[PDB]
Write a protein that binds this ligand. Structure first.
Ligand SMILES: [Mg+2]
Ligand SMILES: [Mg+2]
Lengths: 153, 60, 394
RNA sequence: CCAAGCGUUGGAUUGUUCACCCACUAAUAGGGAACGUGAGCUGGGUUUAGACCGUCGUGAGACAGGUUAGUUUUACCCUACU
RNA sequence: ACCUACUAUCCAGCGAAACCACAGCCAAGGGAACGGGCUUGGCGGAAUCAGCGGGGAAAGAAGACCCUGUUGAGCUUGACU
RNA sequence: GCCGCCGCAGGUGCAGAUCUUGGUGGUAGUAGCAAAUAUUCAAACGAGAACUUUGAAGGCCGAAGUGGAGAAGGGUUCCAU
RNA sequence: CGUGCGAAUCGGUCGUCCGACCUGGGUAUAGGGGCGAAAGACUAAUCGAACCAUCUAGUAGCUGGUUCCCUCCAAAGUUUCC
RNA sequence: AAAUACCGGCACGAGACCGAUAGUCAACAAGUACCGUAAGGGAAAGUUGAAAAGAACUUUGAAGAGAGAGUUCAAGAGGGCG
């Protein structure tokens, strides 16, 4: 199918996708824009820091009701949380992309993520009960993810 | 793995509650694959399960 | 409509910016004015509050109902460690403001002064003031200091000396010294510069700066509490039990035609950690620190004229979450602003103190030194053991 | 006259605005803020129907004439304050 | 004035509703005779978090008060048939 | 599969109507996951155990029970893989 | 609590408890009618005349709205009557 | 008996009627599913590819979910596919 960003070179670059993941759209977009421009080893170290709760993700656009923290002073922002589930799914996605680079016959340490995008998805339908007999929704917000790796020395 | 069926059957055989029943925790996979009451009677004859005694009430 | 049963307010207007201040040390806002009539002395001093105890003194004043009688009062203990001088700094009088010219540092800068610049004392390799101290062993470095002596003579008016507290004598956990500017009252600019050059890298005594029975000013930082309410901070009239939406809030804040709200009505916010300035505190006694000569130590601080003993001001079992006062101390009237292990600024009086009540020599009779923890009833260990006799395993 | 800087209470009754009395002080001066003021409280009386007595209307009803009990929802959105 | 528990606050997972012409720095003037928008004067210098209720003539219900319509219902009488 | 030209015909021209149906936003990652005391360790099939299993310890309901069985009612909700 | 667990629940708290005591099943009483120790009180989340369909697209001197362009002409809030 | 009426049913034909929120409410397993104790009320819903030639083969991963190949004129038609 037609993608959003065509690759500059099919030999060096590669793509991978993840469809229908039960993760939040805002948190997934924010961690994608945070991990978009780093090296793969620094990205794995950052995911280890998220797992050990050492380095959080700052929220600059969707900034509401989030407490301040000192560990986000490296990026230059007050708020910060740890999207652990989205981090585990993107860790599986980077593992699948590294396997795709291995199937293509690519180098390991020279891979740099260049582009990643979080697109919308059809939502589920469930509800909960409240007072006076009024049905109110309990809907989710799934998303589709695509990412591009490129060897840059 | 799952002994909620064998606890109910042991309570039904010993004709008491399932609280005062002591199972043998040594070989769980060897005890669990019984699938009949004849194997339960064989385990009773071997003497692995123990009917736990009544909690005392000292009238002294 | 107006208020029928009138009552003006319950609150202060001089302290309405209730925010947490950026500064830590209590800074002197108004310095004393210099004049050639006064000799060389220091304006302000920096100390630490240690404790609080009773006092026994003789009251003698004319016309009062109580005359020639014995009373008790609450007196403070402020430990006053000596400071190390690390140089001076000049200030030229500009029409825009008060601008400095050049900061002059000392040769042997102490490590307690070097701890202020560095954040991590272990990781840092101590690279500050390595090439700056090369000016002390050559002719080119000494000519720069000689030309600054004549350049600061013409334009620089106010010369403030730089000092820092000696933390090495204190057994406390912290080791970082507090830098402080002190204006020098004295003669001319040349005499002030010669006195600063003579007293460079010297210990600052307490008795030469502050003396007996002077009504001095106290500057300190209020102990912080946390985010408190309008009732907890302003202490207004409370609402009775019959209220529905709470009984410890401000009921009527605004009105219809004043559609906005101002700071006239008392509001909630930050309570604690604020700057204060107390005035009119009487000095009673300047205590002496510990000293040892020929083995026999001298600790006659609590020993008054009528004590007929020889012991220090340390209570039974030490102080309460403070430590031990190893250095010399001073004793003031009332209670100062601050808390335990809090920095404190002593300041000379700006107003001309000429009052009938605040001019009286205090006869030191007795100092109560007992264990404030629990219920202490003894002054010293030998008196307590003389009362209690032997023990089980003596 | 300059002059609003700082001050101008408590209690018995009335639902009371208003009005009266006592004790005291320095004065116990007079007002506004959409009749200042409920996503700030209170319902004592008015101001849903239930009943009592008195008058009038033949009659359903009316009484500046009373008595008695009568369901008070939500700020997490913006500005302003801290 | 003080204490405990349940609260409230931060982190992992999940995750609404009301409201919505558009947005919410002020004073004076006039007006459908009380405006955030018009004119003139003051000012306005990223983005969020815990309180608060002054304002948004805060949401509600084509007012539960009054009157009219050659609009309808119940009670009651010696109105009319 | 469609356009122009000569005559004729219409269910033929939308911005509203607290218009109808359907779809999507600010709100908003906000409020919230508080009626009734209490759980803590070892191993385990399994990739994976604050919630599941057994073994141990500490408690609650206190015979008017957080117990066993019935009727109305529900209709395979009972058990095995 | 009051956008609830709840289109009427819970805490403190009571009146009564061998007699004008509550009540399990079958049956009689249905709408200008029934029941009612009398409150237009109740009659399936609805009772100053129950629910559904038809007449009915009942009536409305009254509110709400009523869709392309260009050109020319160019108004009255009144005499009298019901 | 004769010329008179026919909206339901048995067999058709025709149309300046409508074209998937339109036309019978229902173009499909429609008075069907569903709601109400009941007389009763009453929906949503078309367009793979001419032809299934419906993806064999390798790898990541527990599987889900990817990355290369194959078909065909094109996947620009990828199992809810004009
Ligand atoms: Mg004490
Ligand atoms: Mg009173």
């Amino acid at each position: 199918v037609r993608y959003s960003l065509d690759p500059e070179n099919p030999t060096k670059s590669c793509k991978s996708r993840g469809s229908n993941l039960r993760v939040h759209f805002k948190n997934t977009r924010e961690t994608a824009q945070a991990i978009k421009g780093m090296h793969i080893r620094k990205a794995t170290k950052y995911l280890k820091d998220v797992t050990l709760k050492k380095q959080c993700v700052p929220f600059r656009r969707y900034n509401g009701g989030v407490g301040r923290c000192a560990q986000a002073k490296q990026w230059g922002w007050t708020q910060g949380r740890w999207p652990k589930k989205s981090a585990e799914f993107l860790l599986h996605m980077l593992k699948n992309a590294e396997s795709n680079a291995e199937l293509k016959g690519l180098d390991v340490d020279s891979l740099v993520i260049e582009h990643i995008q979080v697109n919308k998805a059809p939502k589920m339908r469930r509800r909960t009960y409240r007072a006076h007999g009024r049905i109110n929704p309990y809907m989710s917000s799934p998303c589709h993810i695509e990412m591009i790796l490129t060897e840059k020395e | 793995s799952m002994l909620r069926l064998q606890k109910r059957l042991a309570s039904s055989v010993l004709r008491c509650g399932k609280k005062k029943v002591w199972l043998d925790p040594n070989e769980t996979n060897e005890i669990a694959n019984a699938n009949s009451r004849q194997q339960i009677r064989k385990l009773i004859k071997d003497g692995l399960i123990i009917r736990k005694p009544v909690t005392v009430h000292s009238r002294a | 409509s107006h208020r029928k049963f009138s009552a003006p307010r319950h609150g202060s207007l001089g302290f309405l910016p209730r925010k947490r201040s950026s500064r830590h040390r209590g800074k002197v806002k108004s310095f004393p004015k210099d004049d050639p009539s006064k000799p060389v002395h220091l304006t302000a001093f920096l100390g630490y509050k240690a404790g609080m105890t009773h006092i026994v003194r003789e009251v003698d004043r004319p016309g009062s109902k109580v005359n020639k009688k014995e009373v008790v009062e609450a007196v403070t203990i402020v430990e006053t460690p000596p400071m190390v001088v690390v140089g001076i700094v000049g200030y030229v009088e500009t029409p825009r403001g008060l601008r400095t010219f050049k900061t002059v540092f000392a040769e042997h800068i102490s490590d307690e002064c070097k701890r202020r610049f560095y954040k991590n004392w272990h990781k840092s390799k101590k690279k500050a003031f390595t090439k700056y101290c090369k000016k002390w062993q050559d002719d080119a470095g000494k000519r720069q200091l000689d030309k600054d002596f004549s350049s600061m003579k013409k334009y620089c008016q106010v010369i403030r000396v730089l000092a820092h507290t000696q933390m090495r004598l204190l057994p406390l956990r912290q080791k970082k010294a507090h830098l402080m500017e002190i204006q020098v009252n004295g003669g001319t600019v040349a005499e002030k510069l010669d006195w600063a050059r003579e007293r460079l890298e010297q210990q600052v005594p307490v008795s030469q700066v502050f003396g007996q029975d002077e009504m001095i000013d106290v500057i300190g930082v209020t102990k912080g509490k946390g985010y408190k309410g309008v009732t907890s901070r302003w202490h207004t009239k409370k609402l009775p039990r019959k209220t529905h939406r709470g009984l410890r809030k401000v009921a009527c804040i605004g009105a219809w035609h004043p559609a906005r709200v101002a700071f006239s009505v008392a509001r909630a916010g930050q309570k604690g950690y604020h700057h204060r300035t107390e005035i009119n505190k009487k000095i009673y006694k300047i205590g002496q620190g510990y000293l040892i000569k020929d083995g026999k130590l001298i600790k006659n601080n609590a020993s008054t004229d009528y004590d007929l003993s020889d012991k220090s001001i340390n209570p039974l079992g030490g102080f309460v979450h403070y430590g031990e006062v190893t250095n010399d101390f001073v004793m003031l009237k009332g209670c100062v602003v601050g808390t335990k292990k809090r920095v404190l600024t002593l300041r000379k009086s700006l107003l001309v103190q000429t009052k009938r009540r605040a001019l009286e020599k205090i006869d030191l009779k007795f100092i109560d030194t007992t264990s404030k923890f629990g219920h202490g009833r003894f002054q010293t260990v030998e008196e307590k053991k003389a009362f209690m006799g032997p023990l089980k395993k003596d």
